[PDB]
């Protein structure tokens, strides 16, 4: 399949009905409020269609036509994807109030926060496994011709089995060409993926630490690249450097990234360095 920008539809709502399942509100049960969203609250709950745990996003009452549209676009987009490492959309509630988007529940939440709360708690093979899952989800999106544009650990969700899934459908996470000529491509997402690799091996540390955006920009311009995180295998940091190649054409593709990570998993000694 191929990704279809919902906003190319003469009527954006059409994309919603096509790629998103309409769920009767009587099936949704909001239990608790997790966090805050751009258009409303982010909650957890159960969905009974075997009851299952689900993440639930609500649209703040008094919403404008555009706010509703932009909110639901997340579902018109997510609904076109079907991959183990891309957040699963259960459906949406639009024929009732409040409007909602229901997605699979991820117990461990956001990857950056998860890692910070579990600093140094995982084996190298487990962390590599997380990075593998993310690259796989991204390879799939890139294959669908979907450029994420905001790939970062805060935008990756983690389940109880440590499976990592791409979500969220930033300067220090963005490629130079993307910042200068606003040229966003999968190669641009690869640079971002490299930063994610750093976040993961650094257990949620902030990229470039206290550096300002301008400093980061200048640093990169001066051919500066983030050093290897503490106890981070050399092969992994090398992969990071490959993702941060000035020339976007020189950066590896997600398919090649997954292969490199898989070879490391198959040959654990390669991570000894």
UniProtKB/Swiss-Prot annotation:
Cytoplasmic topological domain: 1-273
Residue sites binding ATP per the record: 34-42, 57
Protein name stated in the entry: EphB2/CTF2
Organism: Mus musculus (Mouse)
Active site: 150
Covalent link location (Glycyl lysine isopeptide (Lys-Gly) (interchain with G-Cter in ubiquitin)): 272
Full-protein residues shown: 594 to 892 of 986
Protein kinase domain residues: 28-265
């Amino acid at each position: 399949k191929i990704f279809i920008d919902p906003f190319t539809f003469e009527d954006p709502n059409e994309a919603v009905r096509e790629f998103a399942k309409e769920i009767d509100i009587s099936c949704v049960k909001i239990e608790q409020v997790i966090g805050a969203g751009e258009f409303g609250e982010v909650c957890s709950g159960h969905l009974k269609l075997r009851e299952i745990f689900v993440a639930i996003k609500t649209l703040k009452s008094g919403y404008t036509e555009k706010q509703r549209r932009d909110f639901l676009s997340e579902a018109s987009i997510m609904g076109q994807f079907d991959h183990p490492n891309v957040i699963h959309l259960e459906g949406v509630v639009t024929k009732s109030t409040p409007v909602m988007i229901i997605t699979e529940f991820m117990e461990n939440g956001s990857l950056d926060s998860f890692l910070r709360q579990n600093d140094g708690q995982f084996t190298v093979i487990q962390l590599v496994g997380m990075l593998r899952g993310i690259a796989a989800g991204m390879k799939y999106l890139a294959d669908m011709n979907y450029v994420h544009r905001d790939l970062a650990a805060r935008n990756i969700l983690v389940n109880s089995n440590l499976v990592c899934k791409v979500s969220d459908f930033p300067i220090r996470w963005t490629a130079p060409e993307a910042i200068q000529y606003r040229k966003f491509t999968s190669a641009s997402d690869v640079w971002s993926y490299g930063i994610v690799m750093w976040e993961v091996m650094s257990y949620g540390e902030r990229p470039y630490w206290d550096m300002t955006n301008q400093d980061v920009i200048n640093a990169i311009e001066q051919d500066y690249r983030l050093p290897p995180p503490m106890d981070c295998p050399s092969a992994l940091h090398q992969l990071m450097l490959d993702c941060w190649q000035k020339d976007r054409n020189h950066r590896p593709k997600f398919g090649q990234i997954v292969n490199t990570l898989d070879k490391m998993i198959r040959n654990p000694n390669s991570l000894k360095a």
